[PDB]
């Protein structure tokens, strides 16, 4: 028995088991319970906290994902299997993994949050990507994930109803951080110190905590990789979140209470089974069970409060990767593959933004067409592929990023941005795909310290120079190296500068303007068009 | 005779014309000033096309310039040459249709290709006789047969009340395409060749050598056209039939005058000058580059809008010259955008940039201003003034300019033309313009009539070699349909426009350099996205 694995929480004693980083051994706690199970009666309730235990709960292993959709677009291939469930799928889904330096640490040490994306239908923190060990080993972190429900059973609403009021894997994601607040302090964090960070619907789910007030006092410092609360797809009205559930229920076979009652006889795969019918039209980059504007959780739109928060204590990390669209185009548009060069005609490029830009007019996808269009070549199958990843990544990522990095710093925080433009060495999709949405989350983690990997040595630097900017972010809300003069200063965001970072192999380079002048026909003109079309 | 030159004395259908022997810098050149192609449109004879002139008797002399037609006198800026050289130089008369001829001296041996000026100002303004307008340094230094024409402008040729008798319509165009039929006439008296004529003309008179393009009957009367700055198609040089009439009818209530025929024999009685100050009364909207009497689609000499003529044209036959200058929009802002003027760097805010936006494209709705100002706007520096300025200018030359001439040269040359296209950048030394405005509308005239080799004109070298290759380009482009020296082989070309490759030249003090699409995003935004926000 070796007493630095063995932690005594609240709940109980946990044993962790101790596990080999490249550079030492690191301690990991994993698969504790935070919640009672949301299962039976307790399916789309808000989580309650989890009972207390007797003796040694045995914190070694993964625990089970939660219930979801299983990708099959391409068996058996890395690109997209990563991303598929790497344990058992359950309904008793509702744990969290911590990871701390091997021996624990001496003083109370900044703890991250990582909070995973997978559209809000799929994901869980045991995926290969969300690895602990390389921040905890080499720059001395307590990490942190977990599980929160997806799909129907985190984001099924009823809106006003007492037995599916919507959001409650926000609400496994909000007990999961009043459990570090109380529980961390045994592990050698710092409840003082809590950086949240996640990708894509993470961001969002971590933009959402620093919109509502009761996660607020949980939290000191945010990061957003690829996403944000607002924007076309991470929330959905009441009443579109009412049509999508009573559509579920109804092509399941099933008052309120009396209709989710129904659902809950269901078994969870029939649940899944109808999770793609219920969306309004043809779409890419769209989720059919999301975040809902209840009026609680979210007192009113991300949109409405962004603009008329106050934000002046918050320090926040947000950017995008080079190439947000091109994942999703293989999802959805006729002309894409990842096993062609899927250059496209002009017809395949305007059937592809109405796919793309599923809530759009005919002259806003005109609009929309006419922008992206290079007029000096307007047929080259080439710049139009590449076109439509610009369409479906400015519209859901890059121009939503900068709106809210703008809001952000004209409100009073302190806003760092970036573009990340490395393309690993490793990556099994295309190259006409370029750098895809999710794939600088294995850098920031530092999977290429790892020489089994068989990443270059000039990424591996490069992993060790995000970490050290994420950890630094961390510890001082500010990602530039006070040990270092001599390595480029990266500048706060500013609605006037507008400056931001590239991260690739090269040292930081500043820019200035995310997007601008393409961002202001998103952010300024499409909304007045069609608030009048 | 018997003591005059006798090299100086020839025959029209008219009668003996006396001409005037001027001094090139290179040597003489024969001029023949005033000479009348149509009966007085006087009187009776107001608001109705132009009939023939009845031949004179005797020798009529042909030594100066005769009257401008009757027309508003710029006063912006008194005494200012800027202004000052594009106003009246001879005494406003309605009895002004008249051309001027410049040949070598002595005339030349064989067949001489002719050029034909046709000048702007709006369809409001301007006259044959104004010094940048001068064909001495083309008919000496290269030879031209060079005819400019005056033709009646504002309201004595545009005021129309379609379908009637009294005031057709386009009467000013009917005026240039007699000038047009005299050449073909009278022009081998001179040594011009009636089967080699090219027309040029600069912003309204580019507009009227489109719609000669673009009127079957005038088609007959020319080989080859150069639209320099303007176009028959975009937002200023037509008016629909019922616009026309509306701004007739409001016009003769202005002036005390309210069936046509009554209604115009009332407008005959007011003085033409009565007529001069109430012409800008009937604009339908505080604007700037719209003017009140300009071509009318009457069905007649516009058998269907301009548009819909260019999109339907076969011009396998035609060959064009088309360009723009660097800074089109900037004159136009001193004129009626509040917070530009010629005396101070009009750096302006965004709430003026806002307003000028509305003067500017007047015809758009709220929705179009603000997609004007969205897609201007450098969001970088959303405030900055100097960059508001000049945003400002590109709005009006982008709309009024250089996107109707890059969507005529685009269907131009999708419809069979061969098109030569360029962009025109070089700021004359000696422009007394403020240095903001750029290579202003109008600026390149000078350069390719060649005032600079007048040494007492006081432009550089540099310039003067600058004029001498504009000049072989336009008359290389009047002899053969190719402003490329066929001969000369070493400079660099000038390709045609194509659809494919978009390819026009740099005119500057540098050798000529291709550039490839003439605002192809910006003009996409004019062109083909705020037409069909109107729809809807
Ligand atoms: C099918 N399954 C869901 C049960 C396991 C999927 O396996 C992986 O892709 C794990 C390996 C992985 O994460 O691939 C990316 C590794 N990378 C980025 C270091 C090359
Ligand atoms: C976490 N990650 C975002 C980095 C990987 C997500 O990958 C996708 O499948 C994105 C494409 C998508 O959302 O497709 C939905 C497919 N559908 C409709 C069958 C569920
Ligand atoms: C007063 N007026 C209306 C009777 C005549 C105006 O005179 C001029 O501006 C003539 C000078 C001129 O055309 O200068 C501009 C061209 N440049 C630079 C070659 C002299
Ligand atoms: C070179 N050019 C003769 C072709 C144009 C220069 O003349 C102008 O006045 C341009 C500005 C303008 O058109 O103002 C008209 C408005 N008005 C009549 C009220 C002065």
């Not at 121009?399 to 573009?419: E, N, W």
Request: with cysteine; hydrophobic share 40%; net charge negative.
């Amino acid at each position: 028995e070796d007493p630095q694995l063995l932690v005594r929480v609240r709940g109980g004693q946990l044993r962790g088991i101790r596990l080999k980083a490249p550079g030492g051994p690191v301690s990991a706690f994993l698969g504790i319970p935070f919640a009672e199970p949301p299962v039976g009666s307790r399916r789309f309730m808000p989580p309650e906290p989890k009972r207390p235990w007797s003796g040694v709960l045995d914190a070694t292993t993964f625990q089970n994902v939660c219930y979801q959709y299983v990708d099959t677009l391409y068996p058996g291939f890395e690109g997209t299997e990563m991303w598929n469930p790497n344990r058992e799928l359950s309904e008793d889904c509702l744990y969290l993994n911590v990871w701390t330096p091997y021996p624990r640490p001496a003083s109370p040490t900044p703890v991250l949050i990582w909070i995973y994306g997978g559209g809000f239908y799929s994901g869980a923190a045991s995926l290969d990507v969300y690895d602990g060990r390389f921040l905890a080993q080499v720059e001395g972190a307590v990490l942190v994930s977990m599980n929160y429900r997806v799909g129907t059973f985190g984001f099924l609403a009823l809106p006003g109803s007492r037995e599916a009021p919507g959001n409650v894997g926000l609400l496994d994601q909000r007990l999961a951080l009043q459990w570090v607040q109380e529980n961390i302090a045994a592990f050698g964090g710092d409840p003082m110190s809590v950086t949240l960070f996640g990708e894509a619907a993470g961001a969002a789910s971590v933009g959402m905590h620093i919109l509502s007030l009761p996660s607020r006092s949980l939290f000191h410092r945010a990061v957003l990789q690829s996403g944000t609360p607002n924007g076309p797809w991470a929330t959905v009205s009441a009443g579109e979140a009412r049509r999508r559930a009573t559509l579920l229920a109804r092509l399941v076979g099933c008052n309120d209470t009396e209709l989710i009652a129904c659902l809950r006889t269901r078994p969870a795969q029939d649940l899944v089974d109808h999770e793609w019918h219920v969306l309004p039209q043809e779409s890419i980059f769209r989720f059919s069970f999301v975040p809902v504007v209840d009026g609680d959780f979210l007192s009113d739109t991300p949109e409405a409060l962004i603009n008329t928060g106050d934000f002046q204590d918050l320090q926040v990390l947000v950017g995008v990767v080079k190439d947000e669209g091109s994942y999703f185009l293989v999802y959805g548009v006729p002309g894409f593959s990842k096993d062609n060069e899927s250059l496209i005609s002009r017809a395949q490029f305007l059937a592809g933004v109405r796919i793309g830009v599923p809530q759009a007019s005919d002259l806003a996808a005109e609009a929309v067409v006419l922008h992206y269009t290079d007029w000096l070549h307007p047929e080259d199958p080439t710049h139009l592929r590449d076109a439509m990843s610009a369409v479906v990544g400015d519209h859901n990522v890059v121009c939503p990023v900068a709106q809210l990095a703008g809001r952000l710093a004209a409100q009073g925080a302190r806003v760092y941005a970036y573009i990340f433009e490395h393309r690993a060495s490793t990556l099994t999709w295309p190259l006409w795909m370029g750098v895809p949405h999710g794939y600088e989350i294995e850098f920031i983690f530092g999977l290429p310290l790892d020489p089994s990997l068989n990443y270059t040595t000039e990424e591996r630097i490069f992993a060790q120079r995000l970490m050290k900017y994420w950890t630094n972010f961390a510890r001082t809300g500010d990602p530039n190296d006070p040990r270092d003069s001599k390595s480029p200063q990266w500048p706060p965001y500013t609605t006037a500068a507008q400056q931001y970072v590239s991260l690739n192999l090269k040292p930081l380079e500043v820019r200035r303007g995310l997007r601008a002048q393409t961002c202001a026909f998103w952010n300024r003109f499409l909304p007045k068009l069609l608030s009048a079309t």
